[PDB]
Symmetry: D2
Subunit: 332 residues, 4 copies
């Protein structure tokens, strides 16, 4: 399967890293960004969060050269000018953070067969969470979304609670790492005024559609969940704080056992269960979607609980992108 990465940022670079880590048969034909391949190769090899990678990788003849892989570098900001027809592209990984279905469809017009958006999409874009609803993928879905990092953390936990106890209502907060949409010092973010305030000086409230998105991947939870975010001064790793009213009376220990059991069966490689005294840095490089923190959660009574689940919003999400690409390869 021939892919290109459009936007070689945190997610674009770490998707390529996770492809190389599993020796994937996925063929990465090109990388597109706003700068030249020499700088993009440097950013791929040296990572402040995830450490150095691909020490033998070089920029040569306008390509990223790594073993038998030679990946063409492009620097074309306009999707209508991208040479996807000439490069016989099966899937565009759309990871610029700029691109509505109508904007993303320009990749198809430029000759790509499919687009995978590394973010929530607006319009008639099927949204998938590996281990929750990815088997709903149909080859007729030419533009798909892998949802947000937050939805990938919440949806597996919500599915376990739905299947074991039922959910009456849930309100979610994510305490989220700073990301590339934020600023080093106070500046303008036109769609999110708070989001422009200095990232490492502030706790910053933010909107998230993650809780509503769980209602699309698990229709039984439509209208039953909403939530919000706080952006805080860490460079990576985020946590979901789910306050949930269950349909059946249970114990905190029974919830722990249900999540532990799911991690060992239906949610293998998606959910992990820990009882260790973890902090955010313990999840840097963690490939799971959702790590249930058994010690951190609290119970008010037999139906009302606050549950805690960690996610590496960079590497966990990047690993899910590669999982979804490999699933689409096998089912298209």
């Amino acid at each position: 399967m021939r892919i290109v990465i459009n936007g070689f940022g945190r997610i674009g670079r770490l998707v390529l890293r996770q492809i190389l880590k599993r020796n994937s048969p996925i063929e990465v034909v090109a990388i597109n960004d706003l700068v030249a391949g020499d700088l993009l190769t440097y950013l791929f090899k040296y990572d402040s969060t995830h450490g150095s990678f691909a020490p033998q990788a070089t920029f040569s003849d306008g390509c990223l050269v790594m073993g038998e892989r030679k990946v063409h570098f492009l620097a074309e900001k306009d999707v209508q000018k991208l040479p996807w027809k000439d490069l016989d592209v099966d899937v565009v990984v759309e990871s610029t953070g700029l691109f509505n279905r109508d904007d993303v469809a320009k990749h198809l017009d430029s000759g790509a067969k499919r687009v995978l958006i590394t973010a929530p999409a607006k319009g008639d874009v099927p949204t998938f969470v590996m281990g929750v609803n990815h088997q709903q993928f149909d080859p007729a879905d030419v533009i798909i979304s892998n949802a947000s990092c937050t939805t990938n953390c919440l949806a597996p936990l919500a599915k376990v609670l739905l299947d074991n106890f039922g959910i009456e209502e849930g309100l979610m907060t994510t305490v989220h790492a700073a990301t590339a949409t934020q600023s080093v010092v106070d500046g303008p973010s036109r769609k999110d005024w708070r989001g422009g305030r200095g990232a490492f000086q502030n706790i910053i409230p933010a909107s998230t559609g993650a809780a509503k998105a769980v209602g699309l991947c698990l229709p039984e939870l439509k209208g039953k969940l909403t939530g919000m975010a706080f952006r805080v001064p860490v460079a990576d790793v985020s946590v979901v704080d789910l306050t949930v009213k269950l349909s059946s009376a249970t114990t905190y220990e029974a919830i722990c056992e249900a999540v532990k059991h799911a991690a060992n069966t239906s949610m293998k490689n998606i959910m992990y269960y820990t009882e260790e005294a973890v902090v955010s840095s313990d999840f840097i490089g963690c490939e799971y979607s959702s790590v249930f923190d058994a010690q951190a959660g609290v119970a008010l009574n037999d139906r009302f609980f606050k549950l805690v689940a960690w996610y590496d919003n960079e590497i966990g999400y990047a690993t899910r992108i590669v999982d979804l690409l490999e699933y689409v390869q096998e089912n298209s």
Copy 2:
């Protein structure tokens, strides 16, 4: 009213700052800590969070000199050796963080102080007050009192407004809390709190808090109805309460906003503030309110289930409440 400050830390120093920032009968006659007065004077005058103060203040001859006002400096770790009888002390502000058991705190009375105000939740049933919530329940016979935690001072006023207007069925609270002096610059041991020893500015750190249960002490109707947890994050000051609450009556988010706005204008004047501004944590550095309701940040799931957001300067808001409680309790 003659007071002494035992423990000249974040809270001890900012209590003195807030005394000097108002017209007050309070006479600060002595300060006790573990180091000499020259270093304590330096820390009072230069503050990384709250900026410089009292530029004309000097250390001379074992006293803090501010015009003709002279405060004795002591460096005596043992409460049984403190000269409270000789200094005719009306109230000890107990802000070391070491002495919260009645038996430990009573040693101040044995040493000659008439009353002790603990700047923290107490262990045992020490009368606990939140200004604007239950401070009028103070009795002159109460010789050892607590001003609760910063978090309880943020949550309790909001909980009182909800209780009085709508009723509360159940609530689960998270505080996203600034790093404090109990934390470590790099990973080290914290025997009662393993996570709390992990590098403070590298991590989101879960913590246990009794703040939601403590609301049950000031508002008996809410005993058994609230609990919660904390995440410590890399900001040096300002914290936020995220209250997920099931109310006893059907209402709207707008009705909650109106009730809080009304309370801030009347019964909670100078305790609660109501904002619709695009606020972030740094906007509350130096804020003297106990609880600042963030109208834009909150979400409603339905007519009974809400997630409400309230900010607090855990240093200056709390220090201001200590001075308010001193002025309320003491005879003049």
Copy 3:
């Protein structure tokens, strides 16, 4: 004097703040940026570093309204379309960080402005001024001028005191500098500075600076005698100069302290400050001085070779100097 602020960023907003703080008779007639006036008003009123300001300021009818000041908001990226003729502009404060070549900056004059003050070092034939060092060399014929960098404003006053008292043979400067808007929250591309894109709050980041060479422009006797470098570190504001200097005459560290203390009381009043306190960077947030000499931090190897330490609020110190230079130009044009 009618001014406009082109680029309402850290420097643009704090220039307006410092104008209002001294109740300056300077008239700010317009602000240009890339975003709407309601968001720019919000950023002016709420500042993570310097606290809230102008609580009664409002966005109304495409203007910033503050008492009798009514400032037009523009959102025009192209200097050739800016209405400087219609607004009768005396000085453009050029604070976008995009326009530092004389040819780019001259488009402001073509659009009707009488003068441009670039809030950065300039390329080409642009007279560069440091208040208290060479600002009296300003000539009314200078239609495009530079206020140099924050770093040059910190180093040049100290270099002048050393030059005048002892002479300088050679010097090498490091600035340990706060993170700025050119940096990124997480690793990203900076095409002209690869290191400068690496996560700002995860890294000590080496950077190039022309500040030491620029001192040779304001003090020609020091041409070829200074160079230096920077490290960007995870603080949101306040920077420090570390000057390693070989002096022309033998002295003591205490004689250097006395010369700086004397200068701060006389020739460098309101430009240099002298401290012996145990200061740290946060102590200078909101400090309006160009250069604060840290007497306790410095070291002497011998009677000619010294390491001297001087602090600067790279935001507020520099913004205050912009207002001082505007007021000087007003009085001398």
Copy 4:
């Protein structure tokens, strides 16, 4: 060789990590700190800076158990009560940061044969830097020092300059990561007032004896070097900025070639030479003492230069401790 680690902090734990990483024949028989082995095991396994280690490690039977290694845990604050005679201790790694030769000699009185202090020492304590003067070690040296992280970075570079060009005079600044002697929020540090100011809110000047200490390992540089430090908000990795007047005329390129040559020959495994666009995070886990940054340095003229060298103050220094222990093992 039977060793114990006294003070299981950043250096103590990472010394054990580096022993295990090279499968050293050094036998670690005991670890002493102020808290129990369950918490010390947790801190060994989970590291905010260097990531997780020894997943199979357990606290079991009062020991740290890792394969065939079983390390006894102690919690004795008083060196005079440590059971070094009973444990047949060949070398104490003294890494508490509390312990003059007379104070350190109490380890010998308690039954240890030798002490290696992980810091500069006062009194008649031979001080060694691997690759500079470690071959001056004599088995008769019962108390030895591995100097500071900063001295281990500067001394190898200074030796290359001395041998190739000669040094007239040098003034050094280290821009240094925050360390455990610092505070999360403003507090008192009696011998270092600035060092008590909030570590992640400030650039903090400090004194360092590192430049003078180079005069101990390279006597020809006595009286020719001094310097200072700035502590900054990073959790690890530091940089030396050496302003040096050389005894002979040269070029920046000739300095680069001399350091490159040394890194390939006499300074193999001690110095590294890079021309990459490096930043501090690129050296997290770097085992070199001194990494010369060719691109960062500047020349004023043919005798006056500013040279830049990086060091992982935790892992580089810890690796040198293990190198010095193995050198002592081979030469005693």
